[PDB]
């Protein structure tokens, strides 16, 4: 998980965090901001939920753009960066790049994970299990989550129950006739 702010935009939609079409996917998403497509502008893309506090924690990253109304309608920059360069508090990382027009690429670093980390810290010296109560209460919380997954699986099965019958059956136009009939009586009278 991670929390921060993205600090620019490139096209209303631009190239995803990754794709299975060349390796494995990471979200295609868009922030709609618009400008001219062959000479200067320097727009922005924004959210609270896009710069969310949950996240895939880390990657050695690839910057790709796409789109840009219809005047651009296509890619605009290609770049790469191992992410330790963009540290989490105030810790700016930056570019200037220009695959069809110049853009001084600006991004701000103004403001299971825990489990795996704990293992490492445990391994780092001579140590005990101490207050294992904490683990008991945690497994109970895990269970509340597991219940939820099962609930989702039940809903998964429920979803097809009526859909077979719904796909199975048309009467449909039957309604329009009685509706017209109800209207016609009244109008005629």
């Amino acid at each position: 998980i991670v929390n921060r702010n993205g600090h620019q935009l490139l096209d209303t939609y631009f190239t995803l965090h990754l794709c299975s079409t060349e390796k494995i996917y990471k979200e295609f998403y868009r922030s709609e901001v618009i400008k001219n497509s062959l000479n200067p502008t320097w727009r922005s893309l924004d959210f609270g939920i896009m710069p969310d506090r949950l996240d895939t924690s880390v990657s050695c990253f690839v910057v790709k753009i796409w789109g840009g109304k219809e005047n651009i309608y296509q890619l605009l920059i290609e770049w790469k960066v191992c992410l330790d360069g963009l540290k989490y508090l105030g810790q700016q990382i930056h570019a200037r790049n220009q695959n069809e027009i110049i853009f001084g690429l600006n991004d701000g670093y103004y403001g299971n994970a825990q489990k795996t980390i704990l293992l490492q810290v445990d391994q780092n010296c001579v140590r005990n299990s101490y207050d294992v109560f904490s683990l008991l209460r945690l497994h109970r919380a895990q269970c509340a989550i597991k219940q939820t997954q099962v609930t989702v699986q039940k809903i998964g099965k429920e979803i097809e129950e009526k859909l077979r019958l719904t796909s199975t059956s048309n009467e449909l136009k039957k309604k329009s006739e009685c509706l017209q009939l109800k209207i016609l009586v009244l109008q005629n009278e």
Partner: peptide, 14 residues
């Protein structure tokens, strides 16, 4: 699901 099982397995592996 694996993380909840890994919690239990880890508490065993401790």
């Amino acid at each position: 699901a694996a993380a909840a099982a890994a919690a239990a397995a880890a508490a065993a592996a401790a």
